[PDB]
Design an enzyme around this catalytic site. Sequence first.
Site, PDB file in Angstrom:
ATOM      1  N   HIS A 139     -39.741  38.280 -16.083  1.00 48.43           N
ATOM      2  CA  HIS A 139     -38.595  39.142 -16.371  1.00 48.43           C
ATOM      3  C   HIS A 139     -38.813  40.116 -17.525  1.00 48.43           C
ATOM      4  O   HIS A 139     -38.078  41.104 -17.613  1.00 48.43           O
ATOM      5  CB  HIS A 139     -37.358  38.320 -16.720  1.00 48.43           C
ATOM      6  CG  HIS A 139     -36.855  37.457 -15.604  1.00 48.43           C
ATOM      7  ND1 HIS A 139     -36.588  37.949 -14.345  1.00 48.43           N
ATOM      8  CD2 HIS A 139     -36.518  36.146 -15.578  1.00 48.43           C
ATOM      9  CE1 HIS A 139     -36.135  36.970 -13.580  1.00 48.43           C
ATOM     10  NE2 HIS A 139     -36.070  35.868 -14.308  1.00 48.43           N
ATOM     11  N   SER A 150     -42.044  39.163  -3.609  1.00 45.02           N
ATOM     12  CA  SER A 150     -41.159  38.189  -4.234  1.00 45.02           C
ATOM     13  C   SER A 150     -40.208  37.607  -3.196  1.00 45.02           C
ATOM     14  O   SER A 150     -39.621  38.344  -2.394  1.00 45.02           O
ATOM     15  CB  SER A 150     -40.376  38.808  -5.402  1.00 45.02           C
ATOM     16  OG  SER A 150     -39.509  37.845  -5.992  1.00 45.02           O
ATOM     17  N   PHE A 151     -40.100  36.280  -3.197  1.00 50.12           N
ATOM     18  CA  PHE A 151     -39.095  35.537  -2.448  1.00 50.12           C
ATOM     19  C   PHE A 151     -38.083  35.025  -3.465  1.00 50.12           C
ATOM     20  O   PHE A 151     -38.472  34.392  -4.447  1.00 50.12           O
ATOM     21  CB  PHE A 151     -39.734  34.363  -1.692  1.00 50.12           C
ATOM     22  CG  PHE A 151     -40.941  34.741  -0.872  1.00 50.12           C
ATOM     23  CD1 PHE A 151     -42.202  34.856  -1.459  1.00 50.12           C
ATOM     24  CD2 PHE A 151     -40.814  34.982   0.492  1.00 50.12           C
ATOM     25  CE1 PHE A 151     -43.313  35.207  -0.680  1.00 50.12           C
ATOM     26  CE2 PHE A 151     -41.915  35.335   1.265  1.00 50.12           C
ATOM     27  CZ  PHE A 151     -43.162  35.441   0.674  1.00 50.12           C
TER      28      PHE A 151
END
EC number: 3.5.1.98
Length: 369
Positions: free
Chosen positions: A136, A192-193
Amino acid sequence: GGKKKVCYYYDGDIGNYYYGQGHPMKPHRIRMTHNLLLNYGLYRKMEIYRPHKATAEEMTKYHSDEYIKFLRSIRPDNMSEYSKQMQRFNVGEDCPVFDGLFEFCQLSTGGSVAGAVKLNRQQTDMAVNWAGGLHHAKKSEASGFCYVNDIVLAILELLKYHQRVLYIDIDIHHGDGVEEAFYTTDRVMTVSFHKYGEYFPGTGDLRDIGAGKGKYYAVNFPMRDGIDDESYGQIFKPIISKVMEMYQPSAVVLQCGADSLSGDRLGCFNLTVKGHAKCVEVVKTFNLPLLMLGGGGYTIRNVARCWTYETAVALDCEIPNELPYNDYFEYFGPDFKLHISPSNMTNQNTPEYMEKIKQRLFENLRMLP
Ligand SMILES: C[S@@](=N)(=O)c1ccc(C(=O)Nc2cc(-c3ccc(F)cc3)ccc2N)cc1
Ligand SMILES: [Ca+2]
Ligand SMILES: [Ca+2]
Ligand SMILES: [Zn+2]
């Protein structure tokens, strides 16, 4: 085929950093992970390295000088004087100031960059840094408990020697910091999942596909509450196989955030350790240089189980379900087993939903050269 050489990065000081009373991020889980896999004897099968403390020079390969200078300077004792700068850099609440914050950043970052260097030198097949995966953090801003984006820095290192790098992210959250860093280049494909829909960090729509030279090199699979091993297995190997076929990367970074596990204190998925680790097995079979990183995970007994088992998977070493004695044995009651059972929460992801989203992503992957 064949078994792989694995280099594993760990600093025993990591478990002593403390985000503060009631904060769900517990760096101690990294020490629990280490102690469990030592007690399984996995140290016999891999090289264990203590990472260096990454320098401010290393971190500003991505982050801005002013943000790193702030992180170097801010302390609990001088907080009151920096109240303006803390807001500017999103430090203070979810990303608190604590004792040793900058050293903590240097440790998590050092393991990921050290592993990338080792892979670049062709001195290992796989490098593991469970303290990393801070997907992040942004160029000039902390976010989501993350301050320094070890993943972006490690990928920048891999790009010195690799034309194309594939990033895969099975944390329950969207890997927004990593996608943003590489959104406009085709030299990194991000996959991304994640849970999507009124959920942190708010990004990762199916329709976010990259921009400019990077258009079609960002891949997002949005998911609903309660996904289980069966639903995840429906789509992970087909999507990664298609990505491998079309993109042909020469190195892979796999973020293994464990907040996608059943029973996570913060997350809302229903994967077991076996279903989570199937992803590692899938990526492993493509026989590419692989950097495996940690990520989220807030039920720390299950984090330790998950990353211990995935270390065993990386080593092609079968380990018993009965947990060996260890320094944190009481955390693993009442069963004292390695593997976990799913809960009875409803899976909001229908099989039709899974196939439909996959088919839409396949359409986008057809647009690669
Ligand atoms: C309050 S919230 N609902 O908005 C919310 C809830 C959970 C997260 C979250 O899981 N963050 C996260 C942190 C890390 C990380 C790993 C190692 C480390 F040393 C420091 C951070 C990695 C991956 C993720 N995804 C962020 C926001
Ligand atoms: Ca993810
Ligand atoms: Ca990209
Ligand atoms: Zn997460």
